[PDB]
Amino acid sequence: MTIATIDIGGTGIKFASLTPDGKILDKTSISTPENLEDLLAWLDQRLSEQDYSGIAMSVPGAVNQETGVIDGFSAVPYIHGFSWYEALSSYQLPVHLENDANCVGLSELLAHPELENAACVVIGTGIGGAMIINGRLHRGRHGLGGEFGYMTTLAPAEKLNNWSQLASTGNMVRYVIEKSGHTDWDGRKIYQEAAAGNILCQEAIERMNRNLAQGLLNIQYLIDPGVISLGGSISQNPDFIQGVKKAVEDFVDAYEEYTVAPVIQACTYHADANLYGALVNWLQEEKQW
């Protein structure tokens, strides 16, 4: 059994053949096509060249599990408005799709197959997330389960002041860009410069970690997960992870109200997390998990 596993994003399309244990057997990618018709022909070319038992996909936007339709909006607009169950029917394979942040959450089941209740917070330009409840994805009435970036941790005012706005890597970058006066920054450089003495980076980091810690304690007391995994590029840096944990410890010690602290850990995967999670989504929906 091989699963044709597909990650569609603005940054490119990946196609990989995975085993049911989650081993990548081969991996290829192209630049995002200009039109649906060029993507379907690429996908036809990849699918045609092994005997696949299933097609699993990580996509941006909100999937309707009943129709195969991806709603909402994303960086790849031509993927929306039709049934992928129909678009791929001719392979006569079971097809499942799932939203990318949910995929990242499910990839943790491969790494930690004993997880029952878990939250995953994917930190990028904004903040997306996922919930697992008794070993399964929790999607919610309107597929909005685990949209932790919508959480307002300040009173809305001129701006919504949702978590994505206050606590994301993109918004830490946007803040150092505004005060440094130039745009040659990313999260990883902010870290090097703070380590080198750079005061404004030190402070960008402290605000970031403190806003994350406030929002992570909310998640802990609202859904009470066994663990919260942090994903996205920045969670791949152990200095970020240690800084967030210390920031959480500091809230807990300061407010007598707090008893339990969340268990926090970096996501296991990142670069291929959507492949692994789209795989694990396929296996669960087909009940081979």
Ligand X SMILES: OC[C@H]1O[C@@](CO)(O[C@H]2O[C@H](CO)[C@@H](O)[C@H](O)[C@H]2O)[C@@H](O)[C@@H]1O
CB nearer to a copy of itself: give 146 or 277: 146
237 binds, among a copy of itself, ligand X, none (CB under 5 to 8 A by kind): none
CA distances from 25 to 176, 216, 269 (A): 41, 36, 17
Helices (H), the chain: 36-47, 84-87, 100-111, 163-167, 169-180, 187-195, 199-223, 238-254, 273-285
Which one of 104-112, 130-138, 171-179, 191-199 is the stretch in contact with a copy of itself (CB under 8 A)? 130-138
CB nearer to a copy of itself: give 88 or 121: 121
CB nearer to a copy of itself: give 124 or 149: 149
Phi, psi of 97 (to 5 degrees): -135, 155
Task: Select from 31, 34, 66, 142 the one that contacts a copy of itself (CB under 8 A).
Answer: 142
3-state SS, residue 182: coil
CB nearer to a copy of itself: give 156 or 181: 156
Shortest-Cβ-distance residue relative to ligand X: 89
31 binds, among a copy of itself, ligand X, none (CB under 5 to 8 A by kind): none
d(CA 190, CA 179): 13
Torsion of CA 248, 249, 254, 260, to 10 degrees: 90
- Is 31 a binding residue for ligand X by CB under 6 A? The answer is no
Shortest Å, Cβ 282 to a copy of itself: 21
Among 105, 93, 119, which Cα is nearest to 286's? 93
- Is 131 a binding residue for a copy of itself by CB under 8 A? The answer is yes
Among 92, 70, 221, 214, which Cα is nearest to 154's? 214
Phi, psi of 254 (to 5 degrees): -80, -25
Number of residues that bind ligand X (CB under 6 A): 23
For residue 154, give both structure tokens.
């300040």
**Residues 221-260, mask of contacts with ligand X (x by CB under 6 A):** ----------xxx--x------------------------
133 binds, among ligand X, a copy of itself, none (CB under 5 to 8 A by kind): a copy of itself
Phi, psi of 33 (to 5 degrees): -60, 160
Long-range contacts of 77-83 (CB under 8 A, 24+ apart): 78/35, 78/36, 78/39, 79/8, 79/36, 79/39
Which one of 44-52, 71-79, 99-107, 135-143 is the stretch in contact with ligand X (CB under 6 A)? 99-107
Rg of the chain (C-alpha set) = 20
Task: Select from 35, 48, 92, 259 the one that contacts ligand X (CB under 6 A).
Answer: 92
Shortest Å, Cβ 167 to a copy of itself: 12
Binding site for ligand X (CB under 6 A): 7, 9, 11, 85, 88-89, 92-95, 100-101, 104, 122, 124, 231-233, 236, 270-271, 273-274
Binding site for a copy of itself (CB under 8 A): 117, 131, 133, 138-148, 150-156, 160, 162, 214, 217-226, 251, 254-255, 257, 260
